[PDB]
């Protein structure tokens, strides 16, 4: 709300390379909570997987994402992001994303948030914690899609990106883990994947 600043002062692509994917199969069914499975656990394992994918995704285009090319964290001109973790900064996309990925990593390493021992329950607020992570992880996708799809197509990794993002968004949507407002930066890519 302070971290997510859409810009009403802006008058309002090739992104719809969206058919390009790998073997997603029945992905809508894949993201569903299996009968008897704990939602927290299911959120946790997928959040970790998505983090890994996104961590690798950004690794491919980080050379192209610099202070010069991206002096403010954005998802196109109509959306800017300021960093804050409650434990807000106008900063560049590389700075923001470094803050973000360290932050997410610390959560996942936090055994009190993401317990790895059998028998140890999730914290009472795990859902809210998971929702902030996924909310902010979405921004890497959005930044890359808006600012660096040229470099993605250069590396011929559009299919791999779409696959990752499609799965991410199908998961997010299944459990309503991100407010439709914050998904604004990619509404039409998303509507194109459903």
């Amino acid at each position: 709300s302070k971290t997510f600043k859409p810009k009403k002062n802006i008058p309002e692509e090739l992104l719809k390379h969206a058919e390009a994917t790998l073997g997603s199969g029945n992905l809508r069914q894949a993201v569903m909570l299996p009968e008897g499975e704990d939602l927290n656990e299911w959120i946790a394992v997928n959040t970790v997987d998505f983090f890994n994918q996104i961590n690798m995704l950004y690794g491919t285009i980080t050379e192209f994402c610099t202070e010069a090319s991206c002096p403010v964290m954005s998802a196109g001109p109509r959306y800017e992001y300021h960093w804050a973790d409650g434990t807000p900064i106008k900063c560049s996309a590389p700075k923001y994303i470094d803050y973000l990925m360290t932050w997410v990593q610390d959560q996942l390493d936090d055994e009190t948030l993401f317990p790895s021992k059998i028998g140890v329950p999730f914290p009472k607020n795990f859902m809210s914690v998971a929702k902030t992570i996924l909310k902010r992880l979405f921004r890497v996708y959005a930044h890359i899609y808006h600012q660096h799809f040229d470099s993605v197509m250069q590396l011929q990794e559009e299919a791999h990106l779409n696959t990752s993002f499609k799965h991410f968004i199908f998961f997010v949507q299944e459990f309503n883990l991100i407010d439709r407002r914050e998904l604004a930066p990619l509404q039409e890519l998303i509507e194109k994947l459903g």
């Binding site: 073997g23 997603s24 009968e35 008897g36 656990e41 890994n52 690798m56 491919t60 990752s164």
Partner: protein, 64 residues
Amino acid sequence: SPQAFKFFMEQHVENVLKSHQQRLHRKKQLENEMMRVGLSQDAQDQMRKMLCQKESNYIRLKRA
């Protein structure tokens, strides 16, 4: 180089699907044997519960 991201995503999609069908498979196997020997619905539900907890434990461990 983007080769690791690429290889992982190509490998990831089929891993997702395999994990999904393996859960179903173990679920089907349990139902099959239960029905074969004709256990009480209480005993069946207990063991279904046990399978679910084991599957839960499994993905926690994969995450670890």
